[PDB]
Design a protein around this ligand. Structure first.
Ligand SMILES: O=C(O)c1ccc(-c2nn(C(=O)c3c(Cl)cccc3C(F)(F)F)c3cccc(F)c23)c(F)c1
Length: 241
């Protein structure tokens, strides 16, 4: 009925449509785990081949988040400067949250290229601390057993944040943010899930993990650049220098 319950519906719709894999497909594939032969197969690959595989998977993930943002009510009505500022700071933070869906807390594995595997699968990359921190973030997020609607509403709030430095129309961003906070709060009350609010990761944790991740991606892109057909060209030039 209210403009808020419709907001919940459209945010969940944008998310349902911009998801790469279905939650039940990832849950049913938890049995399909890489063999020790397939693991060594990945470990023996060049850093540069592993980088190309991961770089493409991560650019495609960002592109789905870009589409998710495009479909959020009022995002397109914000100015290009504000759209870049939000996506630059938040798109990879959304990808990192989304990642908990493809993470199995039982054996500490992630769904990568058709099967589940441990962090050792990424050895050739030579950035074990960063990969361990990503696996740790997904492990803490998985303990919340986030529903699909909760992850949709929370990721919208990760993106729509008026506190990002460099915004031109801060007030137009605040209005979008306040409506999404009401929508998230309203939904958690309706479903008796307000208890996750105290369990959500601190703002600084996500920002800190994301800044470390993107800077490492930026080091690899400098050393071995990949080519990507840009979905949002002005965003692409701000990240790919
Ligand atoms: O318009 C597009 O299609 C588009 C696609 C990807 C990005 C993007 N890349 N990105 C990387 O960290 C990244 C990735 Cl995922 C792989 C290899 C190289 C990079 C690099 F570090 F170079 F940016 C991002 C980090 C945060 C926010 C982003 F928006 C991006 C982008 F800005 C635009």
């Amino acid at each position: 009925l209210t403009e808020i319950e419709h907001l919940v519906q459209s945010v969940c719709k944008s998310y349902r449509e911009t998801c790469q894999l279905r939650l039940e497909d990832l849950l049913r594939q938890r049995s399909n785990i890489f063999s020790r032969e397939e693991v060594t197969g990945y470990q023996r690959k060049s850093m540069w081949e592993m980088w190309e595989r991961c770089a493409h998977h991560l650019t495609e993930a960002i592109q789905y988040v870009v589409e998710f943002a495009k479909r959020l009510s009022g995002f397109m009505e914000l100015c290009q400067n504000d759209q870049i500022v939000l996506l630059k700071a938040g798109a990879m933070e959304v990808v990192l949250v989304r990642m908990c869906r493809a993470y199995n807390a039982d054996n500490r594995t992630v769904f990568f290229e058709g099967k589940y595997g441990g962090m050792e699968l990424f050895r050739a990359l030579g950035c074990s601390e960063l990969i361990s921190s990503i696996f740790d973030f997904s492990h803490s997020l998985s303990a919340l057993h986030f529903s699909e609607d909760e992850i949709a509403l929370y990721t919208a709030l990760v993106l729509i944040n008026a506190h990002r430095p460099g915004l031109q129309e801060k007030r137009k961003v605040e209005q979008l943010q306040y409506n999404l906070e009401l929508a998230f709060h309203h939904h958690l009350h309706k479903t008796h899930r307000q208890s996750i609010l105290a369990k959500l990761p601190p703002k600084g944790k996500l920002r800190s993990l994301c800044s470390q991740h993107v800077e490492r991606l930026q080091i690899f892109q400098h050393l071995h650049p990949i080519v990507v057909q840009a979905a949002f060209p002005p965003l692409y030039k701000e990240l790919f220098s």
